């Protein structure tokens, strides 16, 4: 008999993962209000406290303007429905600028430099309803069945 | 500057509790299918296996016929929504004869020896539509926010 | 985070004012303090006793 050797390639990214070490900025003085937030989906700010300084955030819905994207953190997150989320009434990391991998619902590759359209549930999708000011950063990969896309976020 | 002493009384009932040590019979060769069963509610038999011998039980629904009452067990039950229940695909303890405490939706004391009428979710009700042959044993107690009644069961 | 004043399972007693229009009511103060101590002794059926005010 003759011996053999094999080769395998790792996946590129995971949902809610910082794409690279470019000039980024996070917010950690935010608190989730009335619900839960999926890791890798956009969030909206409902109220900012006048004197205390905290910011109440929740999942994005129709007729609202996005503020940021949640990111992965092994310490501050909880496991539910075989995924990673931020439970209600807790701190949350919200990336307000930089490149990030986020969940998508589209079916084809996007155009580099084009504007980002979001769906009512906060995941990126072509021909969506909500209009933002973020861009695509040129990233298109799938991880074991989940569709991911790379987004450039600018501060509001 | 004098001493004092106080008195408190124990509650006397719990959902799905065996009332006393009279002649009783327990079917333990059953299995719950299609959902979960609350401790202290009536159950129905979907089908019985011809060769293996296991019975298949589920919660009482509209137009069906009750078969028994689920009873308490510190080992076979799962603690969920702050109560004892029987999850799907697990062994269950149905009780087919004797006196048992059952959950009730009535508001007045029943008459001893009358016929027991169940509501469409397997809980006793004074004006239910599902009719049985089981009788009332006389007991009528109230735990914290929970109404319990003594029902005597005989074999179907 | 719930404050000690906002817990929904601590005993609450509505009280008449100890000072009204710049006069004192030590009798009412004494009665209300004694009532609170008796309440704490009673609700726990002698298991616990008040120590601090």
């Amino acid at each position: 008999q003759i011996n053999a050797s094999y080769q395998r390639d790792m996946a590129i990214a995971l949902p809610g993962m910082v794409a690279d070490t470019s000039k980024y900025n996070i917010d950690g003085a935010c608190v989730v209000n009335e619900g839960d937030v999926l890791v890798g989906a956009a969030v909206q700010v409902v109220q900012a406290q006048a004197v205390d300084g905290h910011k109440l955030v929740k999942a994005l819905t129709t007729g609202t303007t996005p503020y940021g994207v949640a990111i992965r953190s092994h310490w501050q997150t909880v496991n539910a429905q075989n995924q990673m989320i931020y439970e209600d009434g807790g701190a949350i990391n919200v990336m307000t600028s930089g490149r990030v991998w986020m969940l998508s619902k589209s079916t084809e590759a996007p155009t580099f430099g084009s504007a980002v359209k979001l769906d009512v549930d906060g995941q990126e999708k072509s021909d969506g309803t909500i209009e933002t000011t973020w861009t695509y950063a040129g990233g298109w990969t799938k991880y074991k069945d989940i569709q991911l896309v790379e987004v450039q976020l600018h501060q509001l | 500057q004098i001493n004092a002493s106080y008195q408190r009384d124990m509650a006397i009932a719990l959902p799905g509790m065996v009332a006393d040590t009279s002649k009783y019979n327990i079917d333990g060769a059953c299995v719950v299918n299609e959902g979960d069963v609350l401790v202290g509610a009536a159950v129905q038999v979907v089908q019985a296996q011809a060769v293996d011998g296991h019975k298949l039980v589920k919660a009482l629904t509209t137009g069906t016929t009750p078969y028994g009452v689920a009873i308490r067990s510190h080992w076979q039950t799962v603690n969920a929504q702050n109560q004892m229940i029987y999850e799907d695909g697990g062994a269950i303890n149905v009780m087919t004869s004797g006196r048992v405490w059952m959950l009730s939706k009535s508001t007045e004391a029943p008459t001893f020896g009358s016929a027991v009428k169940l509501d469409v979710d397997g809980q006793e009700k004074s004006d239910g539509t599902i009719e049985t042959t089981w009788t009332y044993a006389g007991g009528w107690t109230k735990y914290k926010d929970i109404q319990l009644v003594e029902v005597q069961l005989h074999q179907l | 985070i719930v404050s000690v004043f906002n817990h929904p399972n601590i005993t609450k007693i509505t009280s008449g004012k100890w000072i009204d229009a710049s006069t004192m009511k030590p009798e009412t103060a004494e009665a209300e303090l004694t009532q609170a101590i008796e309440t704490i002794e009673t609700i726990t059926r002698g298991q616990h006793r008040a120590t601090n005010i």
Partner: peptide, 27 residues
């Protein structure tokens, strides 16, 4: 799929070493 963290929710948890029992005076 399943994308979770390294440490399960039980590894980061505390159990108090004292229990509380209700009192029912005899009389």
């Amino acid at each position: 799929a399943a994308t979770m963290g390294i440490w399960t929710a039980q590894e980061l948890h505390r159990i108090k070493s004292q229990s509380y029992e209700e009192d029912y005076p005899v009389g």
